[PDB]
Design a protein around this ligand. Structure first.
Ligand SMILES: CC(C)c1c(C(=O)Nc2ccccc2)c(-c2ccccc2)c(-c2ccc(F)cc2)n1CC[C@@H](O)C[C@@H](O)CC(=O)O
Ligand SMILES: CC(C)c1c(C(=O)Nc2ccccc2)c(-c2ccccc2)c(-c2ccc(F)cc2)n1CC[C@@H](O)C[C@@H](O)CC(=O)O
Ligand SMILES: [Ca+2]
Ligand SMILES: [Ca+2]
Ligand SMILES: [Ca+2]
Ligand code: NA
Ligand code: NA
Length: 184
């Protein structure tokens, strides 16, 4: 009940984890999902555990789709560990690029005001009452307006990856959120 040697080596080379950390995360992954394939409902259950005082269902669905690389409706361990690596230990640039993919719902190379608003409304639902909101950003629409004011340099209503990267790095509050390693 362990990973084959070849897979351990492969996954270690593709992530910021060590061999022992990979084998350890697999033990926990298998314990919760014995088949090794996480379903949308199971992934939903996990996110409900991160945010018990809100509704993470909509956001969890968007996240599930992004990191289901091969789009087969299941998150296998290889997809899980690589997602976890970028999201928990990646550099700022690598995290930003996965953040862009999440906001680019149709993967067409632009984030529209409507694509972003859908995600941000999911984020506000997920938080719930667990974050006091300044009045100037107490709605998804207000947050989106501020973001596109800061980042849409050509004012075409869409964000390229270049606009999203430079705009995010300009805001000290965004830089901090994307510069953590194991939550620190
Ligand atoms: C280690 C724990 C905090 C964690 C995370 C996480 O790090 N999230 C985190 C939060 C913030 C920043 C970075 C990471 C994720 C976790 C979940 C989703 C995405 C990323 C990490 C999970 C986890 C839960 C259920 C699963 F099916 C698999 C893993 N788990 C739980 C694993 C644990 O059930 C092992 C099991 O053996 C214990 C038991 O059965 O009693
Ligand atoms: C679960 C965790 C590893 C995660 C994911 C994710 O879904 N990964 C995952 C893992 C395995 C399988 C599938 C998915 C994404 C994550 C990243 C991109 C898109 C969707 C989710 C993030 C995360 C990282 C930086 C951000 F700016 C925001 C969120 N994080 C880290 C969140 C953490 O910074 C929250 C913060 O509020 C707490 C703190 O201050 O430490
Ligand atoms: Ca998959
Ligand atoms: Ca798009
Ligand atoms: Ca633009
Ligand atoms: Na590694
Ligand atoms: Na996408």
């Amino acid at each position: 009940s362990k990973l084959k040697p070849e897979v351990v080596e492969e996954l270690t080379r593709k992530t910021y984890f060590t061999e022992k950390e990979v084998q350890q995360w697999y033990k926990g992954f298998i314990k919760d999902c014995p088949s090794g394939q996480l379903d949308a409902a199971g992934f939903q259950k996990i996110y409900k555990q991160f945010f018990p005082f809100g509704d993470p269902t909509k956001f969890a669905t968007f996240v599930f789709n992004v990191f289901d690389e091969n789009k087969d409706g299941r998150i296998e361990f290889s997809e899980f560990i690589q997602a976890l690596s970028v999201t928990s230990r990646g550099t700022l640039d690598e995290k930003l690029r996965w953040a862009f993919k999440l906001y680019d719902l149709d993967n067409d190379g632009y984030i529209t005001r409507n694509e972003m608003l859908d995600i941000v409304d999911a984020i506000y639902q997920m938080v719930g009452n667990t974050v006091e909101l300044p009045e100037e950003e107490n709605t998804p629409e207000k947050r989106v307006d501020r973001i596109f004011a800061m980042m849409d340099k050509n004012a075409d209503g869409k964000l390229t990856l270049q606009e999203f990267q430079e705009g995010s790095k300009a805001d000290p509050s965004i830089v901090q959120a994307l510069s953590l390693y194991d939550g620190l």
